[PDB]
Design a binder for this molecule. Sequence first.
Ligand SMILES: *[C@@H]1O[C@H](CO)[C@@H](O)[C@H](O)[C@H]1NC(C)=O
Ligand SMILES: [Ca+2]
Ligand SMILES: [Ca+2]
Ligand SMILES: [Ca+2]
Ligand SMILES: [Ca+2]
Ligand SMILES: [Ca+2]
Ligand SMILES: [Ca+2]
Ligand SMILES: [Ca+2]
Ligand SMILES: [Ca+2]
Ligand SMILES: [Ca+2]
Ligand SMILES: [Ca+2]
Ligand SMILES: [Ca+2]
Ligand SMILES: [Ca+2]
Ligand SMILES: [Ca+2]
Lengths: 139, 139, 212, 139
Amino acid sequence: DWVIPPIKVSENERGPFPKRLVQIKSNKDRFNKVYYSITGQGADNPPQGVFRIEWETGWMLVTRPLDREEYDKYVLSSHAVSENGSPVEEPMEITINVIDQNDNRPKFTQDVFRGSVREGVQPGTQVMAVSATDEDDNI
Amino acid sequence: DWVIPPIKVSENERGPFPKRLVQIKSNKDRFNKVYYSITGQGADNPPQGVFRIEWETGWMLVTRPLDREEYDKYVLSSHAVSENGSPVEEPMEITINVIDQNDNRPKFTQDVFRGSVREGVQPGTQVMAVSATDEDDNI
Amino acid sequence: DWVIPPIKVSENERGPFPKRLVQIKSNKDRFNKVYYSITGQGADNPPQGVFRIEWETGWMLVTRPLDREEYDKYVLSSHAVSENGSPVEEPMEITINVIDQNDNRPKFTQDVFRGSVREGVQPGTQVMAVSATDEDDNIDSLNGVLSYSILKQDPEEPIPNLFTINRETGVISLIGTGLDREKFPEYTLTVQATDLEGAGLSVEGKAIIQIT
Amino acid sequence: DWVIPPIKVSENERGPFPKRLVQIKSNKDRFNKVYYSITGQGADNPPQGVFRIEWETGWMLVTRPLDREEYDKYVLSSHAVSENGSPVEEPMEITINVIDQNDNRPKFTQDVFRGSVREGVQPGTQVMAVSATDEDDNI
Ligand SMILES: *[C@@H]1O[C@H](CO)[C@@H](O)[C@H](O)[C@H]1NC(C)=O
Ligand SMILES: [Ca+2]
Ligand SMILES: [Ca+2]
Ligand SMILES: [Ca+2]
Ligand SMILES: [Ca+2]
Ligand SMILES: [Ca+2]
Ligand SMILES: [Ca+2]
Ligand SMILES: [Ca+2]
Ligand SMILES: [Ca+2]
Ligand SMILES: [Ca+2]
Ligand SMILES: [Ca+2]
Ligand SMILES: [Ca+2]
Ligand SMILES: [Ca+2]
Ligand SMILES: [Ca+2]
C-alpha cells in the first residue's frame, strides 16, 4: 500500500498539551458513522494514555512529555468500526520514534581510580587508565 | 483502521514473471494525479528489486523466485504523492510471509560416529547414539 | 491517505472578517520550525488574496465575501518548509465549494413576445409561448425554478378571462369564448415569473396577441 | 514532511534553452483548476527571470546559463491557487546549488615582487616569498 510514515517526536517536549500528531480517515464512511479508536503500549496498554484519538475526527495526539531514555519508540494499531458495530478497515500499524536530547550528564566508571609507576622511568611512559559514560545518543 | 492482511507467497515459485500480488488505491486522487512508490528491504533496500509497484495503477508484484531459507519474510512501506509533489496518505506498512517447501535434504551431525560395547552383555542394551538435521520447516 | 474533506462555504457571507476555515499541522516539526504557505487561484494566483494562511499556526482563512455566481469552486495547494529551507511534506491539495444563495431575480427571454390567433376558434387552443430564467441553482434548490402567471389582459372586454398560462411551461391557451376581430382585434396581457415555484421573487413581461 | 531535495545545476551550462528541472503537482486539484506560480530572487525578484514555471503543468525551468562566481545558490518559493482565487497549499521552499567549473585563471597577488640577499651566504637559505590566487572552488 500507500502506508503511513513513522512519526518522529522530540524528547522532553514542552508547551501546551495536547499536540496533534496526525489525522486519519476511513473513506468507507459514506455509509454510516465511523468510530476511531487505537491500541497498544502507550495506548491502552502500559504506559496507558500517552496517546489518544478523537473517535469522531480521527486526530492523534501526544498527551504529555516523553524521555527516550525511558522508551525510545512506540508501535500502535488503529481502528475504525461502524455505528452498527462492524469493523470497516483492516487495522493499521503506527510508529513513533523518540529523538534524543542532551538531558544526560556523564559519569565516571568508578568513583576513584588508582595507579602506580617507578621513579626512574622515562618521559612518554603509559601509567593509568580512566573511564566514564553518558547515556544520551552517541551514534 | 481497516488494514491490509499479510501476504503469503510460496517459495521456489516458478511461472512467467511478473506476478501481481495486490493493488492499492489512494482515494484522495479526486484532485491530482497520484504517484505510487514503495520502500524497504527487498524494495529499494538490499535485496533491491524483488518487488516493485506500478506508479500509475497501484499494482504490487514479485519479480523473481524466492527461498525462505534465505529470507523468510519481508516488510514494506507504501507511498502516494501528488503531481504537484505533496504526500497525500500517511504511508502504509506491508508484510509478506514465505511458505516453506521441501527443498532441503537432511544431513548427519558428523560424517562418522563411533561406538563400543562389551562382548558378554545382555540383549536390550543401549550402545551408541546418532544425529542429523533438515533445514526446512519442522513446526 | 487520510485526506482532507472539501470545504463548503456559503455565498455572500457577512460578519467580521477573518474567518478561520481549518488548521493544518506537519508533524515533522520535531526538528525545526516549519513555515506554512499555500498556492493557487484565489491564493497567490488571480483572484489573489481571498484565502491566506498563518505561516506559524497553520490556520486557513477566508478574507472576504464571495459570489458562487462568479466562481463556484476553488482548489488550492498547501506547503510546509523548514527554517533551513527544505520542504518536509509533499504538498496537499485543498478544495472549497461555494453553496448557492437566492441572490438572483429571474429575467424574461425577450423584452416583449408577440402572438396571434383567429377569432372563430374553440376553447382549449394553444396560442403563444413565453420564456425567462434565473441564474441561481436549480438542481438542488428552487432558487432557480420559475412559475409563470398572468395578471392583466387589456380590453378587459367582452370578459376578462380569455386565456390562461401553464405555470410550469409558460404556454398560453384560449380558455374562454367571444373573440371578434371586428370589435376587439388585439390584446395586451401582463405576465410574471417567480422564484421557488412562484414563492420567491417576481418580474414582468408583456405579450401581445393579434386576432386573425 | 516528504520535502523536496536541493537541485544541483552546473555552471556555464550550454545547450538548447529551456531546460526542465522538475515538475510539481498539488493534489487538491480534484476540485478546480490550479494555477502554478513561483517567487524569489532569480524569479520575480532581481535577477528576474532566470527560472519560470508553467502555470498549468507545474514544470520548472532554467532559462539561461549561470556563473556560480556571480551567484552560487538560489532559494525559491512555489505557489498554487484555484481559479476561483484561493490558495490551496502552504507555499513550498525550493533550493538550487550551482556547481563550480574551471572557468577561472589564477592571478598573482602583486604585479611584481622584489627581494634581496647577501652575496656570501650558504646554500639552503630562504630569500623571497610570492603570492597568487584562483577564484574557482578549492575545497
Ligand atoms: C393590446 O395592444 C393594443 C395596441 O397598442 C392596445 O391598444 C390595447 O390596449 C392592448 N390590450 C388589449 C387587450 O387590446
Ligand atoms: Ca531525558
Ligand atoms: Ca537524551
Ligand atoms: Ca549527554
Ligand atoms: Ca529453498
Ligand atoms: Ca524449504
Ligand atoms: Ca526437508
Ligand atoms: Ca451572488
Ligand atoms: Ca446564488
Ligand atoms: Ca433566484
Ligand atoms: Ca366576428
Ligand atoms: Ca564562471
Ligand atoms: Ca568556476
Ligand atoms: Ca581555476
